Every structure is written in structure tokens, then in C-alpha cells.
Design a protein around this nucleic acid. Structure first.
Lengths: 147, 147, 147, 147
DNA sequence: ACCCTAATTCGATAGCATATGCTTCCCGTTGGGTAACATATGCTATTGAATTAGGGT
DNA sequence: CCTAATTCAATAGCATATGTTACCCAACGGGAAGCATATGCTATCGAATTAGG
């Protein structure tokens, strides 16, 4: 099983698994009734989603793609190693670890938080590896010019 | 031309090209007597570097890695589309553009502003398409826990 | 497949279904680091749980049974009818509907709202009837003297 | 003596016995003209009545029901045990007792505190074991949507 | 000032190794609905033992 | 230092409620196979600025 299915990349569809991960989201983000698009449309906020595993982090993005068509989604990449313990030479800035990450772009400082707090709670119940997905809020000082 | 040169993802060495990029950044940053590492070792601020062209981004990433042994770098990744002008359907959240980005994790917020400038400045000196690269500072409200 | 199992009322045990439903409660509960018992041991608080279905309420009482040993739990009963629509005589104050409900007794008003918000979040991500379960906070003005 | 009498749960009717209780209430609260209803028909407050004995609680539920067609009454059901005196092993949460309780749902927060005092004095005048019934006022921060 | 002709710069490129996106089968987990035995309550009318009223002294 | 009347709780008993388990099985959601295609990496090549008797 598996192979090519005629829809390339950045062009993912809708599957019963995701739309439940999405519905589970677009119920937790309900609790707060905040704005999602600004009159200006500039991307000044964002949510940074990482950890767990690549399968978990993917399905979560795939659901978030459905729960929030008012946002824009990077594909999953990887993270640089941290700061190594002990006082030796540190790992080389460019170095790659196996943990993935993706980014959620948004137009709103406020509803960034609403998503960060919903993802933290959607994840928190599930059994591993979903429990290990982590979320922080990032806000871009100068806005980001998505094409 | 081309082939396997034994160096895997994130283990790129330095060659007179990339340390030449990195020596430009170091002269902009040897004016700046700021501290680059905290003791809690937490990664709170980011420089989001994007646009330009895959390769000059790739080169700039590669110089930044030699100038700044205190940063951490993602790999290159793609941006998704912004809003669409005029009318019609909007882009899908997931839909991805030809435009690239990487990120530069850092331990202090004072050094992100500094490094956003050096990069904005250093790239304005180099010929096109390099100089169309854009830089915006992140702040992670909770911090990024790099592995 | 049915029958007697030597477990009277208010004397139920533990099995891997309730233990994971209580796992997912603890998680939503850890978010606030608030105290759960005082030195008077007065029962001054409460969480009134109801709706959804009898089975789904039971699995949630059974779960909160494990997740919170500092509380005490009533068995399930049924709710009386509300206000009939229109201006005819209302339903008899004694006549009961099929909704069930249970209660949780607690020693601090603060931890009561942590469990209100913990149950409300736990459930809304789940598919029916678990998400029709509803939660309000109680506070007994003179305390309740459990035997 | 005994047996089936056609009447299912919550469908219990008037007889000269209970209307002697209901008219004791209707004389303690008669010359307190406060308003028992609202137009929103929201069930914000309760009066928790418990202790006493299984049957003399049963009569008072049945009295309270004729006196007040503005209230709603649960059926009877049991209380869990309280704190055992001394750091000996504690009763389980689900632990249940020989003591019973019912609740009185109400639409106003004033009439709640009226009906607590009417009951607390309607019980003052009847012989033991009745006089040991404990009445406490209850409030629902989010209210109870009765079916 | 002019200007055609050297070095000089980086970006663009080829090409191996290996990423992710996309989906379809897989399958352990999560979690509600049910059967079936001991035992709760709701319901009535009848029965029992206190507290209460009566009227002799 | 008083025996008839009174007041309610306690009762028997049918029909039915949940407490409890173990069994069933629909779904929720992570992991892997497998094609197109993206990057990391290097050294080499090419097309733009910058330069001198």
C-alpha cells in the first residue's frame, strides 16, 4: 500500500482522522470569543508547535489546517540541537535533531494565545507521544510578508 | 560536478565563502558589546530570516553559523502564501510558496535585535538577490526548548 | 458477562478504562497549583455534574474517583424537569426526567473551579454523549456535614 | 399491606398526611412575600436538605413539593462518608453511607435563603428523628439547566 | 568624462543522500452501551410507639 | 402525682432505579509503506559589479 495519489505538496485534503482532530480543536478554541482576521491582514503573530513525534505533529497540523482557514501553515521542518550539558564545546549551530516543529501564522496577537491554550489542552489528555507536543506563542516584531 | 561529499544534514564545515559571509557579520557585531548567552540557557528570542532566494538564504544561514557559535539554526523550509488580493478563493492554509525561511534561535532578547540589524545591514551591502532578504525578530513568550 | 462480583454500592474498584479517564483529568487539573484540603475539613464546595448519558457520567465519576481521593462522591440520581414552555401548569416538583447527575464534595472553593474547568475541557473534545455532560460549581453556605 | 399502587417515580400525589407538612411550610413563609420565580427560568440556587432519617426526609420532600410548585426536587439518594478522625486509612471517595439527602432547585437567591429558614423551623417543631434534619443553602455559579 | 577589457563576487548548479508531504492499510487504545446479580429508592396504605390532650382526684 | 387521644415515623411490597463488573465493538489516532519532490552538502561554473599602464 501507499504510493502516489496525484496531489502534490502543500495541497493536502480532508480525512476522517484529521477532521476529528480539528473538531477537537474548534471546540477548545471556542471557550474564548476573539477576532481571527484583522482589517489590515498583516502577519504579526504566530504559534510555534513542536515536540512529540513527526506523526503526531503532522496530524495536529492537518487538523489545525481545517480548524483555522484564517491562518497559514509552514510544513514540518527540524530543530537545532540545544545547549549541551557540561562545560565543553557546544554543538554546531547548524546541527539537526530528530524533533520536528511547524509554525502557525496568524494576524492577531490575541487569538494566537487562544490557539496556544487550545493546542496545549487538546494535546494534554492524549496518550503518548501526543502528550509531548509543546506550544509557545511567537510574535514577530516587524510583521512577516507571506507571499 | 555534484555528488555525495560525506557531510550529512547540519554538519557543513567552513570554506572561504561562508567564513567571508561570517566575517562581515562579525565586524557589524564586534561593535556590539552585548551578552549572547544567559545562565538559565533558555531560548527565548528568534531572528526570522526569509525571502531572497534559496541559495543566498542557504549561504547566509551558513555564514551566520560560523559568525555566531551561540545561535542555533533551523534548516531551510518554505513559507505559505499570504492573502490573495482582488477576489476569489483564498489560499489554503497549508499551500506552500517558492519562498524560503530559516530561523536563528538565541538565548537573550537583546542579541536578537542586534543580530537582526547586522543581517539587515550585511545583506544590504551584497549584490542582488541577497539584499531582498528580510529579517524580523521573534519572541517566544514561553521559550523554545531545543533538544 | 454480567452477574455478581462481590462489590457493593460505594465500593467499586479500579480497571484500565477509569484509570485513563482519571489520567486525562489530572492533566487538566495540574495547570493550577492550588491546595485541595484544609485543617477544618469542612465540606464547603462542590461540582455538580449532569447530562450526556448515564454511562458517560458513571465513567466520569469513576474517573474522578481515582483522580481526586480528597473529594467524596455521591452516587448517580436523576434531575427534575425544568420549566415547561408556554403558560400552562408546570411539571410537578417531584416528577423526574432521565438525565442523571452526581456531585463531588470538596473542602476549598478554589479547587472546585479547577475541577469545573477541568471537567468542562476534558469532555468537549470527546464525541457524544461525553461532551453533553455539563458542569457547574457549588458552594454550601453553611457547609455539608458528611457522616 | 404494601405492594404496587400504580404510581411511578416522581408521580406521587397528595394525601392528607403530606399536606399537613406543606401547610406548616406555607405558614412559615406565607408572610414573607418574596418572588420565587424569574422570567429567564434559570435555576441558580439550591437548598440542600439531608440527615434526619430516610423516611422523615422522604415526607419532607413530599411536603416541600405541595407547598412550593415553584421549586424542583431531586429524588432521595445517599451521602458519602466524611473524614475519619485520626490519620487512619480514609474512606474511599465513592464510599457511601446510611444517610440520605435531596436537593431543592430554585430560581432566585433570596427565596433560597427563605426556604432554608422555613424548613429549619418547620423541622424545629416536629419530634425526633425529624428535628436532626440539616438544611444548608446551595448556589450554582453557572446554574443548572434542568431538562 | 570616456570605455573597452581584466580580475573579482557570489549566486546558481549538478548530483548523491535523505528529508517531508501525501495518502492507504494496520492495529493497539480510548471509551460508551449492555447483560445480570445484590440492593438502592418511589409509591401507597397500614401499623407502632412516642409526645400531647383530657379529666378525673 | 393521673390513662384516652394524637401525631408521624417506620413498614411491607411491587416496580424500577443505579452500583458493580465483564464482554462487545465503533471510533480516535499514531506508525509504516511508497511515489513525487523538497533540502543539506560540495565543488564548479556563470553572470552580474568593480577595476588600471
Amino acid at each position: 500500500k501507499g504510493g502516489w495519489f496525484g496531489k502534490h505538496r502543500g495541497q493536502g485534503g480532508s480525512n476522517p482522522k484529521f477532521e476529528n482532530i480539528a473538531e477537537g480543536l474548534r471546540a477548545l478554541l471556542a471557550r474564548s470569543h476573539v477576532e481571527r482576521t484583522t482589517d489590515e491582514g498583516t502577519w504579526v503573530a504566530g504559534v510555534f508547535v513542536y515536540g512529540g513525534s513527526k506523526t503526531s505533529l503532522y496530524n495536529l497540523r492537518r487538523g489545525t489546517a481545517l480548524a483555522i482557514p484564517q491562518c497559514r501553515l509552514t510544513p514540518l521542518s527540524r530543530l537545532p540541537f540545544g545547549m549541551a550539558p557540561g562545560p565543553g564545546p557546544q554543538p554546531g549551530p547548524l546541527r539537526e535533531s530528530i524533533v520536528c516543529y511547524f509554525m502557525v501564522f496568524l494576524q492577531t496577537h490575541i487569538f494566537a494565545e487562544v490557539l496556544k491554550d487550545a493546542i496545549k489542552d487538546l494535546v494534554m489528555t492524549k496518550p503518548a507521544p501526543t502528550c509531548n507536543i509543546r506550544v509557545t506563542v511567537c510574535s514577530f516584531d516587524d510583521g512577516v510578508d507571506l507571499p
